[PDB]
Design a protein around this ligand. Structure first.
Ligand SMILES: [Cl-]
Ligand SMILES: [Cl-]
Ligand SMILES: [Mg+2]
Ligand SMILES: [Mg+2]
Ligand SMILES: [Mg+2]
Ligand SMILES: [Mg+2]
Ligand SMILES: [Mg+2]
Ligand SMILES: [Mg+2]
Ligand SMILES: [Mg+2]
Ligand SMILES: [Mg+2]
Ligand code: NA
Ligand code: NA
Ligand code: NA
Ligand code: NA
Ligand code: NA
Ligand SMILES: [Sr+2]
Ligand SMILES: [Sr+2]
Ligand SMILES: [Sr+2]
Ligand SMILES: [Sr+2]
Ligand SMILES: [Sr+2]
Ligand SMILES: [Sr+2]
Ligand SMILES: [Sr+2]
Lengths: 95, 160, 154, 186, 140
RNA sequence: CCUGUCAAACUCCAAACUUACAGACGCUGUUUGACGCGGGGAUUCCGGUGCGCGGGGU
RNA sequence: GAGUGCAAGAGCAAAAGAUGACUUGACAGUGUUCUUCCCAACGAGGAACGCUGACGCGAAAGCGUGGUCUAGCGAACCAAU
RNA sequence: UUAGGCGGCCACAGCGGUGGGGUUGCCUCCCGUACCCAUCCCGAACACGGAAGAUAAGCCCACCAGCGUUCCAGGGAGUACUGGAGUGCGCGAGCCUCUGGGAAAUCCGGUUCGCCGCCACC
């Protein structure tokens, strides 16, 4: 890369397909998950806050409690365990 | 400069004029020749020159071949003969030359070329059954000025 | 049920391909194994398709090879009808061969090594640089084709 | 509409019935919503909760079914609103609902409005709802006093049908008194 | 069917686009109600760089205030066919615009469940000329 | 309307393929203790070639 | 397609833009987590998300840990505060 | 749901068009400013109060495919491209065979003029 900021090379992954453009439905921004639940991580281009580092899009972690309204999701980056703070707006239940 | 330097497709497509400046003008004078006010459907015979190998043809070659071909059609059918010929490809690919050794080698802009895949029609002429052998002769002279071997193919025409 | 025989060595073969052969219990050239035809196994053989010879053998051929090259999980002991009878859920090789072909059991379940260590092909094989359709010996074979090979590696 | 790339709003946005930005902020409380809505003739109060396939109304009250308890007056006014809220509130208590947040949809937060009257009604039914007393109309108006004094400038009965000439905020008292009563068939 | 289709005057907007006022006073007396300042957008060479700043004034008349104005306003102009809008409006003159529409226009001006007025229910130049002409004056 | 062409820094489309998690089969581990944890000792931080995909350069 | 301070790419329409009004959360204290440094150790810096305290606005849910997001930054010793 | 309220999915729901529907019922348009409240000017809107009138708007019900969209069959196409393999071909750029996958444009015929959830209600 020519720069090393958090959004380097995120053109595609952080952009909405034209039709999915505009404010997102509130339903999923308010969803509730339980400790132990498997959740897919994917940032919603339309939702500014509660995001995680782009490098983590595509992960499927495990909810292990929460901080404020955001959730604490456990994942494994390569071989290292990490805890990610993320709001429901960017989460989806697995299966 | 020899074509050996640019005939192959061994580089990314380089055509974005919003990021490239100082591109030389094209030497191709015309893309539509003969009687361009008439239609191609108004003719019984349609012959095309087909490229047999994928290549890049510099605008200098297009003009030389287009010239030697249409120039023949003029001499044999008149400055207004009943025919029409088309060069369908346009030189979109920008060419460089590194003219300090290999340091900061990115070349300066020196020209343009058209990328043609094998089996494509470079030229397509439309004429009457009489002038069929004249268009075939124009093409023979045309393919002697572009890198690849070609096929002169008769599309619409069966009076043999 | 297909018969898998490694015909090309490990040197230079992709590691994920070599690991697949090892999961199929083959660790040497000319080693054969019997594999059920499932979606899971189908993918594995497809991945090893270029370094192996495989196909469904005939009852007789399987019987010849089982008699000649089958082995206990441990030890030299010959695997003949008597052995089969005193150690397996079958009365003789044929009963075993049939159950294998019909995929009702496996060499392991019956106390046998999952691998049949064959001998080089008498008269040589068709070459390991081309598939069957091109005259070589690699890839899926005809039941008669597999039989010819297995019998030659008797 | 125009092409592949065209962006059509969410249905309830086209229909201009749901303010999604307000809705989100509303749903953040985690409490049920006290949906206050108005019609030219009636007033509705619903206790809605979030659901997997859409909202869930656990209790509601419509100014129409207000008569079922002895209402012989119009149904598009302050006394009407307050009472409808109280009714819905009481029904809410029965369902086990203890708290809610006021959702006024596309109506304006005008002081003394009916949506706030609805709110005051629900609060009196025993529902815990975040509110602000000085944005609520003063008692008398809720009673319908503003309407009685209006009919004082008679010369022509305010009401077409005959509910009464000078109207009665006293009727309001009777109905409320009737609802706060334990018995009452909800 | 006709009662809820016959035109009406929603508003009469009287305004004077000056360019820098003391004119509010006249509009106030000729109309009957307070005037409104008019700001501008985009800077202009004609010493009109100040974005937000007085430049004109207008008055929107509704109901009687409008009719009682038009009664003495219309007689001052010579209405023409071209002087009419496509929605069924016309502006003459100090400018004086008259906004005409049918009974259920509120449907497109209210907050809740607003909706745009269907073309069929939209007023027409012809339908407008008629209505107006049908009230103290002549067309073209 | 018709007719002739394009894009590493275009996309109404769109693979093969790569990848997170889970189950299943396989293989493997429970005396050959895997996975993991803690500690001692390093060497190493001039690499090269083939193939596939490249970017620069005749 | 406007606008949103400035590269580029991205976000945004009953708004994240415009107007008007009010206001000083550009607040004090202390954390969790990610980033910096994929995997995989490493500081300053940065961000997201909390709690405690005190406040602003709003009917209220709620929003405000500066500017819609990714640049705008600096150890020890010493001095001043 | 003989017209309602809150929604989920967020164009299969858009754009455009045709037909039908309302005596004390519903939604509206509608009528009207003493009040709560309101317009940097207007009871236009917002807010409040109310039924003389109407089904013309909206809305709800039935329907049309011309445009946009979703999905399906056939054609394009097992083409373009491509993961694995080759002492296969080509001066070479490159191509081919075997194995495992597999488009896009476009043509043609269908589909689509929303579906579903909760509450209330001749
Ligand atoms: Cl993160
Ligand atoms: Cl409402
Ligand atoms: Mg990219
Ligand atoms: Mg052994
Ligand atoms: Mg020999
Ligand atoms: Mg050989
Ligand atoms: Mg120093
Ligand atoms: Mg100092
Ligand atoms: Mg009608
Ligand atoms: Mg060779
Ligand atoms: Na969105
Ligand atoms: Na130099
Ligand atoms: Na840090
Ligand atoms: Na002003
Ligand atoms: Na109607
Ligand atoms: Sr190259
Ligand atoms: Sr040649
Ligand atoms: Sr990749
Ligand atoms: Sr921010
Ligand atoms: Sr009015
Ligand atoms: Sr050569
Ligand atoms: Sr297939």
């Amino acid at each position: 890369p020519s720069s090393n900021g958090p959004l380097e090379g995120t053109r595609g992954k952080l952009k909405n397909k034209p039709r999915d453009r505009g404010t997102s439905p509130p339903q999923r921004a308010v969803e509730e998950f339980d400790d132990g639940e498997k959740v897919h991580l994917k940032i919603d281009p339309s939702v500014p806050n509660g995001r995680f580092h782009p490098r983590f899009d595509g992960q499927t972690g495990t909810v292990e409690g929460k901080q404020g309204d955001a959730y604490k999701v456990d994942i494994v980056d390569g071989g290292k365990e990490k805890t990610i703070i993320v709001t429901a707006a960017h989460l989806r239940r697995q299966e | 400069k020899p074509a050996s330097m640019y005939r192959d497709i061994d580089k990314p497509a380089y055509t974005r004029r919003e990021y490239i400046t100082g591109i030389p003008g094209s030497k191709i004078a015309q893309h539509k020749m003969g009687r361009k006010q008439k239609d191609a459907d108004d003719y019984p015979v349609q012959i095309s020159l087909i490229v047999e190998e994928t290549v890049q043809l510099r605008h200098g070659s297009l003009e030389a071949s287009r010239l030697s071909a249409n120039r023949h059609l003029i001499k044999e059918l008149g400055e207004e003969g009943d025919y029409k010929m088309t060069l369908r490809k346009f030189p979109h690919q920008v060419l460089r030359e590194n003219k300090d050794g290999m340091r900061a080698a990115f070349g300066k802009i020196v020209g343009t070329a058209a990328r043609v895949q094998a089996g494509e029609q470079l030229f397509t002429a439309y004429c009457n059954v009489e002038d069929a052998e004249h268009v075939k002769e124009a093409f023979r002279r045309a393919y002697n000025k572009i890198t690849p071997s070609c096929r002169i193919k008769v599309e619409r025409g069966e009076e043999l | 049920m297909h018969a898998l025989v490694q015909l090309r060595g490990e040197v230079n073969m992709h590691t994920d391909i070599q690991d697949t052969l090892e999961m199929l219990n083959i660790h040497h050239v000319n080693h054969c194994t019997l594999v059920p035809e499932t979606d899971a196994y189908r993918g594995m053989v497809a991945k090893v398709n270029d370094f192996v010879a495989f196909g469904e053998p005939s009852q007789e051929t399987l019987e010849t090879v089982l008699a000649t090259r089958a082995e206990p999980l441990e030890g030299d002991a010959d695997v003949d009808d008597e052995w089969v009878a005193e150690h397996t859920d079958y009365d003789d090789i044929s009963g075993l061969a049939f159950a294998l072909l019909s995929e009702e059991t496996t060499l392991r379940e019956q106390g046998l090594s999952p691998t049949l260590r064959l001998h080089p092909p008498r008269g040589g094989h068709d070459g390991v640089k081309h598939p069957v359709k091109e005259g070589g010996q690699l890839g899926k074979h005809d039941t008669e084709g597999i039989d010819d090979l297995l019998e030659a590696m008797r | 509409a125009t092409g592949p790339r065209y962006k059509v709003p969410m249905r309830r946005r086209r229909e201009a019935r749901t303010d999604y930005h307000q809705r989100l902020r509303l749903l953040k409380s985690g409490k049920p919503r006290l949906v206050a809505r108005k019609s030219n003739k009636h007033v509705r109060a619903q206790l809605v909760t979030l659901g997997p396939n859409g909202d869930d109304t656990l209790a509601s009250a419509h100014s129409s079914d207000l008569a079922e308890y002895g209402w012989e007056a119009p149904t598009g006014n302050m006394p009407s609103a307050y009472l409808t809220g109280l009714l819905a509130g009481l029904r809410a208590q029965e369902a086990g609902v203890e708290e809610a947040v006021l959702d006024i949809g596309l109506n304006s937060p005008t002081p003394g409005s009916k949506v706030f009257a609805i709110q005051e009604g629900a609060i009196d039914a025993g529902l815990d709802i975040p509110h602000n007393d000085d944005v609520l109309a003063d008692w008398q108006r809720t009673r319908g006093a503003h309407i009685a004094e209006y009919d004082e400038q008679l010369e022509e009965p305010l009401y077409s049908g005959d509910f009464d000439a000078a109207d009665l905020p006293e009727h309001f008292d009777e109905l409320r008194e009737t609802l706060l009563d334990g018995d009452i068939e909800l | 069917f006709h009662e809820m289709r016959e035109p009406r005057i929603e508003k009469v907007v009287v305004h004077m686009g000056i360019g820098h006022a003391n004119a509010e006073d006249i509009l106030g007396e000729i109309t009957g109600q307070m005037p409104v300042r008019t700001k501008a957008k985009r800077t202009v060479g004609e010493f009109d760089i100040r974005e937000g700043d007085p430049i004109g004034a207008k008055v929107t008349l509704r109901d009687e205030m409008a009719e009682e104005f038009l009664q003495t306003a219309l007689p001052l102009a010579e209405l023409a066919t071209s002087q009419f809008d496509d929605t069924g409006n016309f502006s003459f003159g100090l400018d004086v615009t008259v906004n005409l529409v049918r009974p259920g226009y509120r449907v497109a001006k209210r907050d809740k469940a607003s909706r745009s007025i269907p073309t069929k229910h939209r007023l027409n130049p012809a339908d407008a000329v008629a209505f107006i002409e049908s009230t103290y004056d002549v067309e073209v």
